[PDB]
Design an enzyme around this catalytic site. Sequence first.
Site, PDB file in Angstrom:
ATOM      1  N   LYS A   1       0.236   3.492  -3.026  1.00 37.07           N
ATOM      2  CA  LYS A   1      -0.882   4.410  -3.175  1.00 37.07           C
ATOM      3  C   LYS A   1      -0.382   5.846  -3.341  1.00 37.07           C
ATOM      4  CE  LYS A   1      -4.502   1.611  -0.975  1.00 37.07           C
ATOM      5  NZ  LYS A   1      -3.717   0.357  -0.835  1.00 37.07           N
TER       6      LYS A   1
ATOM      7  N   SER B   1      -6.103   2.834   3.625  1.00 33.67           N
ATOM      8  CA  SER B   1      -5.474   1.929   2.662  1.00 33.67           C
ATOM      9  C   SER B   1      -6.520   1.089   1.931  1.00 33.67           C
ATOM     10  CB  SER B   1      -4.441   1.023   3.346  1.00 33.67           C
ATOM     11  OG  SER B   1      -3.411   1.770   3.948  1.00 33.67           O
TER      12      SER B   1
ATOM     13  N   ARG C   1       5.363  -0.762  13.191  1.00 37.01           N
ATOM     14  CA  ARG C   1       5.923   0.063  12.129  1.00 37.01           C
ATOM     15  C   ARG C   1       6.106   1.495  12.605  1.00 37.01           C
ATOM     16  NH1 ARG C   1       1.339  -1.276   7.815  1.00 37.01           N
ATOM     17  NH2 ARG C   1       0.149  -0.748   9.698  1.00 37.01           N
TER      18      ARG C   1
ATOM     19  N   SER D   1       0.798  -1.223   0.000  1.00 38.78           N
ATOM     20  CA  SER D   1       0.000   0.000   0.000  1.00 38.78           C
ATOM     21  C   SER D   1       0.834   1.278   0.000  1.00 38.78           C
ATOM     22  CB  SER D   1      -0.971   0.009   1.190  1.00 38.78           C
ATOM     23  OG  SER D   1      -1.934  -1.025   1.057  1.00 38.78           O
TER      24      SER D   1
END
Length: 242
Positions: free
Chosen positions: A50, A95, A227, A47
């Site tokens: 994007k 997302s 993350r 993602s």
Amino acid sequence: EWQENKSWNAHFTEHKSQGVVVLWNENKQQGFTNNLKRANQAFLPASTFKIPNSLIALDLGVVKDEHQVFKWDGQTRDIATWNRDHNLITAMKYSVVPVYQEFARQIGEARMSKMLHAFDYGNEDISGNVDSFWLDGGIRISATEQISFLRKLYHNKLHVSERSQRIVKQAMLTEANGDYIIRAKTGYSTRIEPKIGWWVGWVELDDNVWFFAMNMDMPTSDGLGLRQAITKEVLKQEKIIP
Ligand SMILES: CC(=O)NCCc1cccc(-c2cccc(C(=O)O)c2)c1
């Protein structure tokens, strides 16, 4: 100039995790990472794609602006927030793959391929299905290559209109307070091994900008929050954010 700081490995080790964080200091034009090798290993962008996808869709008119509503197709999917209407802002925030799959289908193979080459984006290979190649096709990008791309975006240097770049940078807005602004995009790659999570973007300060790109092993969705958590611990260690 690049500098390796294996002390950041502790932030991954603390969580029984493995990964790489890459920092780029824009004022000093200096890079920092815990793992020079993995910093240059190419993964599926998932993602994080994007970002380029939004830029292309905006520049070609597939997306009119950040207010255009992309109606839910009525198919119940397992991500609850996907089962609703979206614009570019919310589609990026959550997302929403099916929204961007339609973008890619309307962009088409030829224009998508030309644009990723114009962006110098990763290996620039869209082999696979036009509506999923960033999830299980042949496209690959490294953490250092994410930064090079993001630096161009920040400076409005990509080969799309300034407006398209401003809009995507707006859509990337993740966090803002009196100390910093984070514009970033998460990624979660599961269809091809190794399963990884991404977080790429930058930190705007009063008189500098720190670009960052991290990926980490993600055997289960339970660790997705790491993350941001690991990245921010690195930022705190380098006294980039309080
Ligand atoms: C239902 C639910 O919330 N499951 C747990 C969360 C989950 C499961 C499966 C896929 C994703 C996903 C998909 C695309 C992009 C990203 C991203 O973080 O960029 C994440 C998230």
